Design an enzyme around this catalytic site. Structure first.
Site, short mmCIF file in Angstrom:
data_model
loop_
_atom_site.label_atom_id
_atom_site.label_comp_id
_atom_site.label_asym_id
_atom_site.label_seq_id
_atom_site.Cartn_x
_atom_site.Cartn_y
_atom_site.Cartn_z
N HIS A 75 164.62 48.11 155.06
CA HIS A 75 163.84 48.79 156.10
C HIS A 75 162.64 49.58 155.57
CE1 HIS A 75 167.55 48.01 158.52
NE2 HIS A 75 166.61 47.70 159.39
N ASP A 116 160.44 50.76 162.85
CA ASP A 116 161.43 51.23 161.89
C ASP A 116 160.88 52.34 160.99
OD1 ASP A 116 163.84 49.91 162.43
OD2 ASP A 116 163.33 48.12 161.27
N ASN A 236 164.59 36.86 160.38
CA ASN A 236 164.74 36.46 158.96
C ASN A 236 165.43 35.10 158.79
OD1 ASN A 236 165.65 39.84 157.86
ND2 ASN A 236 163.61 39.01 158.30
N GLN A 284 176.47 36.03 156.65
CA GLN A 284 175.26 35.45 157.22
C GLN A 284 175.58 34.37 158.25
OE1 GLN A 284 171.96 36.43 157.02
NE2 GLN A 284 172.95 38.18 156.02
C1 LIG Z 1 169.64 43.21 162.96
C2 LIG Z 1 169.30 44.65 162.58
C3 LIG Z 1 168.14 45.18 163.42
C4 LIG Z 1 169.02 44.76 161.08
C5 LIG Z 1 170.21 44.21 160.35
O1 LIG Z 1 171.26 44.83 160.45
C6 LIG Z 1 170.17 42.93 159.54
C7 LIG Z 1 169.02 42.15 159.37
C8 LIG Z 1 169.06 40.99 158.59
C9 LIG Z 1 170.26 40.60 157.99
O2 LIG Z 1 170.43 39.48 157.20
C10 LIG Z 1 169.36 38.66 156.74
F1 LIG Z 1 168.75 38.08 157.82
F2 LIG Z 1 168.45 39.41 156.05
C11 LIG Z 1 171.39 41.37 158.17
O3 LIG Z 1 172.53 40.95 157.56
C12 LIG Z 1 173.76 41.67 157.66
C13 LIG Z 1 174.50 41.22 158.89
C14 LIG Z 1 175.28 40.02 158.37
O4 LIG Z 1 175.47 40.22 156.97
C15 LIG Z 1 174.65 41.28 156.49
C16 LIG Z 1 171.35 42.53 158.95
MG LIG Z 2 165.50 49.32 163.68
ZN LIG Z 3 163.52 46.29 162.13
#
Ligand SMILES: CC(C)CC(=O)c1ccc(OC(F)F)c(O[C@H]2CCOC2)c1
Ligand SMILES: [Mg+2]
Ligand SMILES: [Zn+2]
Ligand SMILES: [Mg+2]
EC number: 3.1.4.53
Length: 326
Positions: A75, A116, A236, A284
């Site tokens: 972030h 963010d 992503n 994932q």
């Molecule tokens: C959605 C929220 C706004 C941000 C978030 O929590 C987030 C964003 C991208 C992720 O994975 C990858 F795309 F980079 C991610 O993976 C976590 C969940 C599953 O295993 C790890 C969490």
């Molecule tokens: Mg956010």
């Molecule tokens: Zn975001």
């Protein structure tokens, strides 16, 4: 000039899904948000339309970018730049041609840029569970998202930072409301209701003579922009694999650091935050299956067939991650 030449070349891909955002972050001297936002504003003629002084834009963007945490793995300013650019591409989808006003476009892009800001690298639930000042300030309700908005708007009042200085009072009022509605919709606690409503819209979809989406009221218009930025925030796994894997590396680092703080406090470690017991690949696949694909399949239906290649990439990436498990 040589590094500047290479940066300019890379920024020529600003209208493309899969922009080399990490390369841009390096080439710009860790200013991906500033350079990508400036490029998009120029591309969309937003400086002229809203009479934004270039120096004011750059001053605001650099200050905004500074208020992302350089020491947070996911972030940070690169994520902000990525969501801005992804939103920029989604806004240009054929099915939305001429649908949104310049002010609505400005709102969506600005919302993406600030969405963010000042993120500490821990979740809303962590902030609530640890009795943080943020959670106390915001009464446990969309704690981070309220904070991102407050910071993003507050920075406009810094020296030579009011990029909206030449908007009318009514324009500023409308923009502020739209930006708040959009950023609050990035709270994952709102995802299921947001998706449910998007499905309803798809089922009842109406199109114009030109085959473009018909949105004739604020509720429907803001709903589409909310889901658009939310899709960008959750984009992503829809990106080329070399980008997606870097994002996964970063979110896992951030999650593990939170889990370390929870372990040291004697708290139960949050799901996916225990570096000693975490299946990154299974996580994932679950993330895609239960959250990202349901959302993106529905967006793809709304703008069909504009997003078919994005959806195809998501499905390929799901297959790839799944293949590493057996
Ligand atoms: C959605 C929220 C706004 C941000 C978030 O929590 C987030 C964003 C991208 C992720 O994975 C990858 F795309 F980079 C991610 O993976 C976590 C969940 C599953 O295993 C790890 C969490
Ligand atoms: Mg956010
Ligand atoms: Zn975001
Ligand atoms: Mg910073």
């Amino acid at each position: 000039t040589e590094q500047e030449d290479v940066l300019a070349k890379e920024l020529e891909d600003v209208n493309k899904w899969g922009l080399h955002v990490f390369r841009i972050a390096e080439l710009s001297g860790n200013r991906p948000l500033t350079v990508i936002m400036h490029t998009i504003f120029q591309e969309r003629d937003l400086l002229k339309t809203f009479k934004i002084p270039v120096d004011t834009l750059i001053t605001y963007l650099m200050t905004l970018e500074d208020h992302y945490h350089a020491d947070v793995a996911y972030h940070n300013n690169i994520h902000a730049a990525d969501v801005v650019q992804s939103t920029h591409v989604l806004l240009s989808t054929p099915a939305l041609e001429a649908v949104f006003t310049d002010l609505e476009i400005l709102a969506a892009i600005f919302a993406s840029a600030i969405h963010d800001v000042d993120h500490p690298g821990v979740s809303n639930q962590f902030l609530i569970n640890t009795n943080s000042e943020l959670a106390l300030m915001y009464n446990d309700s969309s704690v981070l998202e309220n904070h991102h908005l407050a910071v993003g708007f507050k920075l406009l009042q810094e020296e030579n930072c009011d990029i909206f200085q030449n908007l009318t009072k009514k324009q500023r009022q409308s923009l502020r409301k739209m930006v708040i509605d959009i950023v609050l919709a990035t709270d994952m606690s709102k995802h299921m209701n947001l998706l449910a409503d998007l499905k309803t819209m798809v089922e009842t979809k109406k199109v114009t003579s030109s085959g473009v989406l018909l949105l004739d009221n604020y509720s429907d218009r803001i709903q589409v922009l909310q889901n658009m930025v939310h899709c960008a925030d959750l984009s992503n796994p829809t990106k080329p694999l070399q980008l997606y894997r870097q994002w996964t590396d970063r979110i896992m680092e951030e999650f593990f650091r939170q889990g370390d703080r929870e372990r040291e406090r004697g708290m139960e470690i949050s799901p996916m935050c225990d570096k000693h017991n975490a299946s990154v690949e299974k996580s994932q696949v679950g993330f895609i299956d239960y959250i990202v694909h349901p959302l993106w399949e529905t967006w793809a239906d709304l703008v069909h067939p504009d997003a078919q290649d994005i959806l195809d990439t998501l499905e390929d990436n799901r297959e790839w991650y799944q293949s590493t498990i057996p």
